[PDB]
């Protein structure tokens, strides 16, 4: 390993004594992938007539030297093609230098396209150059993929494909939002008071002003300020930050899309979110009837819509109606399953919150088929409009697919006095030790007091959506550079 | 006094809650003011009475004209303004009486027939009229625009126009990049080692991992890892963070676009950046011959391309060639202009850096017409490829328009040994007190040691570009929520 690097470093030393070691004048004219497509059906004779001159640059992935003739496989950004090399065509000095290059080196050739006797498409090199020496060899392990994504990208074509699909899916989501009349906006990543979500923040400090500032846990409160300001339809796709546990399923920064539509409510949001996701599949995979991790996932069907208790009953039928309505039962049953209900997060827990907690331990992970869970207790929905007909319930949903939260939304709380009250109740929890409880945001209350129209809002987890569209088993597989441990 | 008004409005809200749902969310508008104004600009009183078009509108009540038998309100939705004509005959006495006590600012809604008033205005003959949300604070100095952008957005149509244009411009830039085959990517905003720029970082901490992290000053080093990985054309549009003073011309977070193209160099980058900017103007304004702050700005002309000393001579013709190549002259001349060259940023200053510093104090702010400044000293260009023909010079540019930096780019340093050396020289400066000097990044060097193809990279200041395109005088005028200033 070190001896290999040293040997390659010594070649680089010699290379510098005889010219420009890292030249930047070569201009490729074609892409391997495009040649493989456009000339799949052409044969030795067809190609000899066309006599197409090409110029390719990329990473040398294989090399075979056999006396007066040598073959290499070169990989550019698009794919692979062979270089065929003889001193007759490339000249003796280049041929000799070529033989001493290494797997990994960035190389470049001009030459005529042709087909080898074994059937492969290849370049009869008439010019051949080394553009950049690979000092470290390519490997020929489970975490290296993430610590050295650049290696994973060279060596695993599937990885390149996943990330091209991420990019296309996000463009497709933008198009969908734009067609539905939403204005894409940029709100701050630095907040003087974090909010818009239940999460532990990252804190930093502005030196000139001697001021604590928080990386955003969510843009929600800023996006609703825009609604007050009179933009009826806004959305934002960007990072949130959450300072919590690390795992294969957790990264400290992740991409959310939030959107807000004045004069809508949660029923509208659910229909709209459902349509968006289904179209996201059709765009990415040609169909909404797909598979994820070896199991059928039919996004073409209408999404299920269930209450919290409906969902517990569907997947944990042993629970009776009377049991799910009994405070004392719910507490002992939650204690049994490892939920400490004495924790400050539960300071304002009523019967609804206990049910929700039971749903999380029993049913949630089993929501394979797309399922909206509907009507959430007020005590855990501090930003959500209260029902007009049932006290203590909010017009809120969460969407689960494959057992993971993909979206969450609600009729927005536009009543400033209600909002102030619910903030004070969060501060109680926070004072009692609940680190995911919200801070009182006076500037936000002030904004609402200018008068905010009734509005519907939703956040979609772009990283999790992309997992489904690319059959990626963890969030780390859809992030170019996941954060890792030391 | 603003207080008595709030209190009075708060008391109306109290009465409102005793008689129904204060913040209803069931009203569904069917039309937009702007669309009605366009579609029926050409129609008259009789036309409209025949058509008899039933509409439903919701928005903010901006003016109210009251007479004995009737009332007119000017209501503003997301699209524009339309009049509501209100009589108790048609809306009912009880509603008419309530209406008289509603306030400028309230969010209101009507159904009714479209018609034209004798004074020529398009209006709704209301048959239903509702209050959707009480404005508790009344609608209405130079900094309030920024602390309360939501107020500025309601009251100033120019502000709305600027931000719609920002959004459109960014979509136009994404399209330009996509058409040129660049793949949009997302790299981390939390870096374990900050780099890619000369700036003071914001520092934070991940608690679960007990790990110091930095908010990114630039994504550059992560984008070049993707080039090692084999993506040929990548770009990213997102926030950087710099922990320094807030001014009218500075915000601690701002939007950059960086792009990288394998097998290109700085000449290519300059042509590409020039085309991008000119097309951005055509897209936004219909022409590249535009105006900024009352002065002609002709982006249609080819951009000037000057060396650092050429530019000093163009604006200060006193300076001779020998003066600008004399160390002792440059120092005394810099001392005269108030520049401290003893500062650690200048620890590795040679003649080039001194020239650059003189250019900053004499010519830079006068670069009104788009001007590329070209060929930068190595000691201030730690990430830029060195010239093949002139030692100590890098293939680097900065683009200035209206005296402000709009872009900066270079042929990328893909030589890992050169890069390691230049990093060690940065660490010297940093150890001697230069807080903008770079840290040594070993992981980045390791990536380059796998072999990176020659590449060209550039960063464009989106916020500053958008200023030019929208004729905004400061960066704060193109950010929805600028950071606090004192
Ligand atoms: N802010 C929410 C998404 C939007 C909820 C509706 N206002 C989140 O972080 O999940
Ligand atoms: N990282 C640079 C932009 C790209 C320079 C070329 N690699 C900046 O922050 O200005």
Author numbering:
A (entry chain A): 15 to 154, 161 to 506
B (entry chain B): 14 to 153, 161 to 506
Quote the authors verbatim.
We solved a 2.4 Å resolution structure of LysRS, a class 2b aaRS, from B. thailandensis bound to L-lysine. The cognate amino acid binding pockets of the B. thailandensis and human structures are very similar and make many of the same hydrogen bonding interactions. Several aaRSs from Burkholderia thailandensis were identified as candidate essential genes in a transposon screen.
Aminoacyl-tRNA synthetases (aaRSs) charge tRNAs with their cognate amino acid, an essential precursor step to loading of charged tRNAs onto the ribosome and addition of the amino acid to the growing polypeptide chain during protein synthesis. First, the aaRS combines the specific amino acid with adenosine-5′-triphosphate (ATP) to produce an activated aminoacyl-adenylate intermediate which reacts with the appropriate tRNA to produce the aminoacylated tRNA. In general, aaRSs are divided into two classes based on the global fold and sequence conservation. Crystal structures were determined for a CysRS from Borrelia burgdorferi bound to AMP, GluRS from Borrelia burgdorferi and Burkholderia thailandensis bound to glutamic acid, a TrpRS from the eukaryotic pathogen Encephalitozoon cuniculi bound to tryptophan, a HisRS from Burkholderia thailandensis bound to histidine, and a LysRS from Burkholderia thailandensis bound to lysine.
